């Protein structure tokens, strides 16, 4: 992963989806979020998960620079994830403010 986001540290405020997450022709998922915080620049926590209690990462994050570079509120960013097959969950953010969206990918 890029050091750029790591040195920013993780974004702490709440994210919100801006539109329904959309499948690509490759079966990956593109999901856009809006960030409520003013602590940018910061790194967007973004993963797929099947177990909401362990939050063990499944699939992978494709986005090369998953960051919010603006310090003004309500900035948007697009994440792209490679989901596992079957049912899973998009998980954006960390802690009590994280948001989730169910996802299903066929061809297990």
């Amino acid at each position: 992963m890029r050091l750029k986001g790591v040195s920013y540290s993780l974004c702490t405020a709440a994210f919100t989806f801006t539109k329904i997450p959309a499948e690509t022709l490759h079966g990956t998922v593109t999901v856009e979020v809006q960030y409520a915080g003013t602590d940018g620049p910061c790194k967007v926590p973004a993963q797929m998960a099947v177990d909401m209690q362990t939050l063990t990462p499944v699939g992978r994050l494709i986005t090369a620079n998953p960051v919010i570079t603006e310090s003004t509120e309500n900035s948007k960013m697009m994440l792209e994830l490679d989901p596992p097959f079957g049912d899973s969950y998009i998980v954006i953010g960390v802690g009590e403010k994280k948001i989730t969206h169910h996802w299903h990918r066929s061809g297990s």
Partner: antibody
Framework: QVQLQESGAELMKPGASVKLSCKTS????????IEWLKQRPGHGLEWVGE????????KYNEKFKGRATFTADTSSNMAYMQLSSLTTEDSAIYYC?????????????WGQGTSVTVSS | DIVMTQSPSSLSVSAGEKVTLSCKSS????????????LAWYQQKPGQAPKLLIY???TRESGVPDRFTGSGSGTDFTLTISSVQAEDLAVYYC?????????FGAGTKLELKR
């Protein structure tokens, strides 16, 4: 709010080269593509090409014969289109627009356009 | 390249009418992996940049009024305005979003009947 602010109107001589800019706000500049479009009266919209400023990757419509070059300054959230060997047929409004290749979200936010007039 | 054909180029309308705009592509805009048609519709008023209305052939961009409906698949697409209003008077473009180079139709202009 997502905004793309383009540079002011240009008056160029034939054979010259123009540098247009597009400064963005409201989103992570290095996370999306900038697409460049050409609109002149009598024609619809024509795609010039694209740059992904976070990487430098660029793609061009062959019809421009290599006369366009896209660059970016990520510290300014600015994308540039240079169009060289201008002719009167390059007189047009040029737009930049935000894009995410791989998605089908299409061209969702557009700059206000820069007018270019090419005349001797 | 993919050619986008809009016909007719102009259409005279009255407030409250149902209007259907046509758009045809030279080859299919369908990607079989996600079974989505990569077709977008834009609205342009004079002195303004185009505005995105519909992406993926049928999905309305946030904030676009519900009276705009995109439909169709493969090579034949339509934009329907169920009850046209005065603010809908504009030029409408469809766009090949399927593969490069991106290409656009020549547009259909809505004008007012009298």
């Amino acid at each position: 709010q997502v905004q793309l602010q383009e540079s002011g109107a240009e008056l160029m001589k034939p054979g010259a080269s123009v540098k247009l800019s597009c400064k963005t706000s409201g989103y992570t500049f290095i996370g999306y593509w900038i697409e460049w479009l050409k609109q002149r009266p009598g024609h619809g919209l024509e795609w010039v090409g694209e740059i992904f400023p976070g990487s430098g990757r660029t793609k061009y419509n062959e019809k421009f014969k290599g006369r366009a070059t896209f660059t970016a300054d990520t510290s300014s959230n600015m994308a540039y289109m240079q169009l060289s060997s201008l002719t009167t047929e390059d007189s047009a409004i040029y737009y930049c627009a935000r894009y995410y290749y791989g998605s089908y979200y299409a061209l969702d936010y557009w700059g206000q356009g820069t007018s270019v007039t090419v005349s001797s | 390249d993919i050619v986008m054909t809009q016909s007719p180029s102009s259409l005279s309308v009255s407030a409250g009418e149902k209007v259907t705009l046509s758009c045809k592509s030279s080859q299919s805009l369908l990607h079989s992996g996600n079974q989505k048609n990569y077709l977008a519709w834009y609205q342009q008023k004079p002195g303004q940049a185009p505005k995105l209305l519909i992406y993926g052939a049928s999905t309305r961009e946030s904030g676009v009024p519900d009276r705009f409906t995109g439909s169709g698949s493969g090579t034949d697409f339509t934009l329907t305005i169920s009850s046209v209003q005065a603010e809908d008077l504009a030029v409408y473009y469809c766009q090949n979003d399927h593969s490069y180079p991106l290409t656009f139709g020549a547009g259909t202009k809505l004008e007012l009947k009298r």
